[PDB]
Ligand binder design. Structure first.
Ligand SMILES: C=C(C)[C@H]1CN[C@H](C(=O)O)[C@H]1CC(=O)O
Ligand SMILES: C=C(C)[C@H]1CN[C@H](C(=O)O)[C@H]1CC(=O)O
Ligand SMILES: [Zn+2]
Ligand SMILES: [Zn+2]
Ligand SMILES: [Zn+2]
Ligand SMILES: [Zn+2]
Lengths: 258, 258
């Protein structure tokens, strides 16, 4: 049985190869998660097909219908066998899908245009001149909506009611708004993407302050799927043999532009 | 049924309170893991007894008999229900017991006596006037034995053969040895422990370099135990509410002596 893998286009995790239109199947793609997928499959002994998630989303649960969208949904509704992506391990997801132990550590972080007078979340919350927001339908937004810590709740209260919207649809959309906003927009996003963008031309953004929380990405499978045990052991083996650090270097730093 | 918890005396995870001899049961102890346990029991709704592991070990498998010792053994052989301790999630353990998602991140790091001329593992591996070692029967020693990375493999050869032994039975033993070696012993240990000790009188040690690897501590239960699911969901909730972060501030930095 060819394992159906859901994933999403997000640099440097999964990206289209330059000559993708001349290539077929799995060969169309490259990146951290493409390399990780090849290694998981070889170590667990399965054949697989990478498929980009149809709605371009990670997965949130619609309040009204309570239907799950994105990669989480593809797993919940039986459309995919496994998701290999920068999918954040969270409580509400773990209630509907299974995760491996994390293959990468991260935290929510602040991205500014260089020179923006902000050094922390506390700084953002006590001022109004510089706008700030997060991605829609992700763990970052849910972290702010749920948090009971004063600084973060105060930030949430601001963001939910800010007009125009401070929320963006895609990482690229948030980074353009930082760049294009002359220092008047700050972007809350995971440290891993922040670090990657900081190493890319035009070299005008930077991560400031410490991370706001601490969590991980995991490989997800449908609840009670039998693939989960093998996949979990593989991730731990690969971490032990240093493959995950090798890959992070390859995709983030070995070719940093800054 | 009262849940039996195996743990181990290791600062600042589990320590006897100054007035323990006046106190009874779970009240004799305090620390990060003591607070963590009360939180897990509360959210999973259970009553528990904290018991210090008889042999004072975390857990490794005897090569001849294949028998597991320490906290891992207590779980495997049916003597405890759960382990709450700085127990490293590793491949070999995950084969015989279950772990929650990590409640704390860490890496292998180098502890030196302030002033020692060492900046990295490379630096250790390329000289021999400074001795260095690790704890017996833990995940750090196994890391160096199993490591196919040139530098880490190189150190392993030196360490296994060295005489006298560069290995230690306890964290305290390693730390003392550093402190009295007048700079000619460096100790390889987990970053969490390193950081804690750095903030304690007589403030003569420091962590140097970045971490050699990235891993996590997890709460362990016997394979296929029912407690596993709730405990896991409980670790994610606590992390999400910032409690794990509050606890680490409480126990590492809030009362630092340096
Ligand atoms: C890039 C997308 C929106 C994903 C990536 N990890 C989080 C997800 O697993 O929800 C999202 C990041 C964001 O929430 O800051
Ligand atoms: C302090 C003890 C021996 C433990 C704690 N974590 C690892 C354990 O879970 O194996 C060990 C540290 C390391 O081996 O340096
Ligand atoms: Zn294209
Ligand atoms: Zn391999
Ligand atoms: Zn006593
Ligand atoms: Zn609580």
């Amino acid at each position: 049985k060819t394992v159906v893998v859901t994933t999403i286009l997000e640099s440097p995790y999964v990206m289209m190869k330059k000559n993708h239109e001349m290539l077929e199947g799995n060969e169309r793609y490259e990146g951290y998660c493409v390399d990780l997928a090849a290694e998981i499959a070889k170590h667990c002994g399965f054949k697989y097909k990478l498929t980009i998630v149809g709605d371009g989303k990670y997965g949130c649960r619609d309040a009204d219908t309570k239907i799950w969208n994105g990669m989480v949904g593809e797993l919940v509704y039986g459309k995919a066998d496994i998701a290999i992506a920068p999918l954040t391990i969270t409580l509400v997801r773990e209630e509907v899908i299974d995760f491996s132990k994390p293959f990468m550590s991260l935290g929510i972080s602040i991205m500014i245009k260089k020179g923006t007078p902000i050094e922390s979340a506390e700084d953002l919350s006590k001022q109004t001149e510089i706008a700030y927001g997060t991605l829609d339908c992700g763990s970052t937004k849910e972290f702010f909506r749920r948090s009971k810590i004063a600084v973060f709740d105060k930030m949430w209260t601001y963001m939910r009611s800010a007009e125009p919207s401070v929320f963006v649809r895609t990482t690229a959309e948030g980074v353009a708004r930082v760049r294009k906003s002359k220092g008047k927009y700050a972007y809350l996003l995971e440290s891993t993407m922040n670090e990657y963008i900081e190493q890319r031309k035009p070299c005008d953004t930077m991560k400031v302050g410490g991370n706001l929380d601490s969590k991980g990405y995991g490989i997800a499978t449908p609840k009670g799927s039998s693939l989960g045990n093998a996949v979990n052991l593989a991730v731990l083996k690969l971490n032990e043999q240093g493959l995950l650090d090798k890959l992070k270097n390859k995709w983030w730093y070995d070719k940093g532009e800054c």
